[PDB]
Design a protein around this ligand. Structure first.
Ligand SMILES: Nc1nc2c(ncn2[C@@H]2O[C@H](COP(=O)(O)OP(=O)(O)NP(=O)(O)O)[C@@H](O)[C@H]2O)c(=O)[nH]1
Ligand SMILES: Nc1nc2c(ncn2[C@@H]2O[C@H](COP(=O)(O)OP(=O)(O)NP(=O)(O)O)[C@@H](O)[C@H]2O)c(=O)[nH]1
Ligand SMILES: [Mg+2]
Ligand SMILES: [Mg+2]
Lengths: 166, 166
């Protein structure tokens, strides 16, 4: 079947693992549990086609330097996550977008900027500015909540459809 | 606020009204009830921005000839619906795609092909062929169910994001 190689990327503590666990195992993890690397494979059906989602869950900071080169090389699509209450995680997004362009020799590489944690009332990153960043890059922007499950299927599936259309 | 002028288009009986009612009033209509025109305005929030969705619910066949010219003129985005158990409604999609290009003087006009009724087990339109049609046009393809609510927020919101990015 079609496999879709997704890698979820972004800063430490943004919720990429609680995103991937909501999708894969339907429940919110409120644990402190930093990732070196976790891989989830799941036979799924998206718009009538069956496919296996092969998600790679990555570390926020880690040793992880040109040591990211290797997974952004194999990955077809990227979820670029930041949290809407962490202004620096929003700013580090240019670090990941460019390095993914550098290792991929591409300017269009299927991607989607995910503003996570939109259940929390004290936010510091307005959607207007986050939507501009995503329009600057020619990329979809989607706000999520791994607490509430708001938009997690939407981030994942829009990204698969971005790969389908590239 | 941003308003988003959506018009839902496609053949008679495909479920465009049960799509719009699922979205607007959360319930499945299993009624025989043909549309001349219905308009739904709803303040909503999509990815942190508040906006009013101004949906125009249209007739499948009707008198409706160059009398469609007027709404495809005002509309910003289109949901092009067919049902996955009605092969001719899948084929009439080129009628609507071209006329929307003709009245809009455009080749990229925000749109999304919706394969409705994916709860029903006897289907005649494979997703593979429907996904090709949507890749031919450079358009998202999304399967829905107004019975089950599967994918109705996904058809509507992907379409708003298509307008945001155009
Ligand atoms: N309120 C709220 N909390 C969330 C959300 N997603 C994750 N969290 C919380 O945020 C913290 C970090 O979550 P985690 O998913 O481990 O983040 P990570 O970005 O994957 N961390 P790492 O970079 O080290 O791999 C946890 O306490 C988790 O419960 C969300 O949508 N909203
Ligand atoms: N099983 C199933 N039935 C549906 C679905 N959507 C609509 N229906 C049924 O299909 C029939 C036609 O629905 P309707 O929404 O009125 O279609 P329309 O395309 O809007 N008709 P018109 O072109 O005349 O405006 C109704 O009996 C309705 O209950 C769906 O997702 N699945
Ligand atoms: Mg993690
Ligand atoms: Mg109708």
């Amino acid at each position: 079947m079609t496999e879709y190689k997704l890698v979820v990327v972004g800063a430490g503590g943004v919720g990429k693992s609680a995103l991937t666990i909501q999708l894969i195992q339907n429940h919110f993890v409120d644990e402190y549990d930093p990732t070196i690397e976790d891989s989830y494979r799941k036979q799924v059906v998206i718009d009538g086609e069956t496919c296996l989602l092969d998600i790679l869950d990555t570390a926020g900071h880690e040793e992880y330097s040109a040591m990211r080169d290797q997974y952004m090389r194999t990955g077809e699509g990227f979820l670029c996550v930041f949290a809407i209450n962490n202004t620096k995680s929003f700013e580090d997004i240019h670090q990941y977008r460019e390095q993914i362009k550098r290792v991929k020799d591409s300017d269009d590489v299927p991607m989607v900027l995910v503003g996570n944690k939109c259940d929390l009332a004290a936010r510091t990153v307005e959607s207007r500015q986050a939507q501009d960043l995503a329009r600057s890059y020619g990329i979809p922007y989607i706000e999520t909540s791994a607490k509430t499950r708001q938009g997690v299927e939407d981030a994942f599936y829009t990204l698969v459809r971005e790969i389908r259309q590239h």
